[PDB]
């Protein structure tokens, strides 16, 4: 019965992305081959089954650097990181396969299913 603020969640996410852009309170570096990306662990956990599984484990909770599998495409990862912080997914014919495979590795099932629909649409 509470009052619903229909733009609040989008506003929060936008502000979290602004904090990331200024490196404010970021607490992890994700290394993907020759590239590095900083982020907030909480957002990663909220958006990815892989990062949720890593950081929920007290053994790994405090890691400040995560090295992803060497086969992961950094562009695919960057596209997905931007999606996590924006709700907008930059799928293109030239990147669909890299994005899909990266989303499978990151355990982002709804994104994977969207990639399958994109393939079906050709």
Ligand X SMILES: O=C(Cn1ccc2c(O)nc(NCC3CC3)nc21)Nc1ccncc1Cl
Is position 12 an interface residue for a copy of itself (rule: CB under 8 A)?
yes
Question: Do β-strands 28-32 and 35-39 pair in parallel, antiparallel, or remain unpaired?
Answer: antiparallel
x/- letters, 2..31, toward ligand X (CB under 6 A) = -------------x--xx------------
| Encoded tokens for 19 | 């904090």
Residue 39 pairs in a beta bridge with 28
Q: How far is CA 63 from the centre of its chain?
A: 17
Which 23-52 positions form the footprint of a copy of itself (CB under 8 A)?
A: 24-25, 27, 40-43, 45-47
Residues shown for the chain = 122
Half-sphere exposure of 101 toward its Cβ, with a 13 Å CA cutoff? 10
CB 89 within 8 A of CB 83: yes
Quick check: 102 binds ligand X (CB under 6 A)?
no
Per-residue interface string for the shown chain with a copy of itself, residues 82-111, x marking contact by CB under 8 A: -xx-xxxxxx------------------x-
**At its nearest, how many Å lie between a copy of itself and the CB of residue 61?**
7
Q: Please report, to the nearest 10 degrees, the dihedral formed by the alpha carbons of residues 35, 108, 81, 4 taken in order.
A: -160
Question: Where on the chain is the footprint of a copy of itself (CB under 8 A)?
Answer: 2-6, 8-13, 15-16, 19, 24-25, 27, 40-43, 45-47, 55-56, 61, 83-84, 86-91, 110, 114
């Amino acid at each position: 019965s509470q009052i619903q603020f229909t733009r609040h969640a989008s506003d929060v996410l936008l502000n979290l992305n602004r904090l990331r852009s200024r490196d404010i309170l970021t607490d992890v570096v994700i290394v993907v081959s020759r590239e590095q990306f900083r982020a907030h662990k909480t957002v990663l956990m909220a958006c990815s089954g892989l990062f949720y599984s890593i950081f929920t484990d007290q053994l790994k909770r405090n890691l400040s650097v995560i090295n992803l599998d060497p086969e992961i495409n950094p562009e695919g990862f960057n596209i997905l990181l931007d999606f996590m912080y924006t709700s907008r997914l930059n799928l293109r014919e030239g990147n669909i396969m890299a994005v899909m495979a990266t989303a499978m590795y990151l355990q982002m099932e709804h994104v994977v299913d969207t990639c399958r629909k994109f393939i079906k649409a050709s």
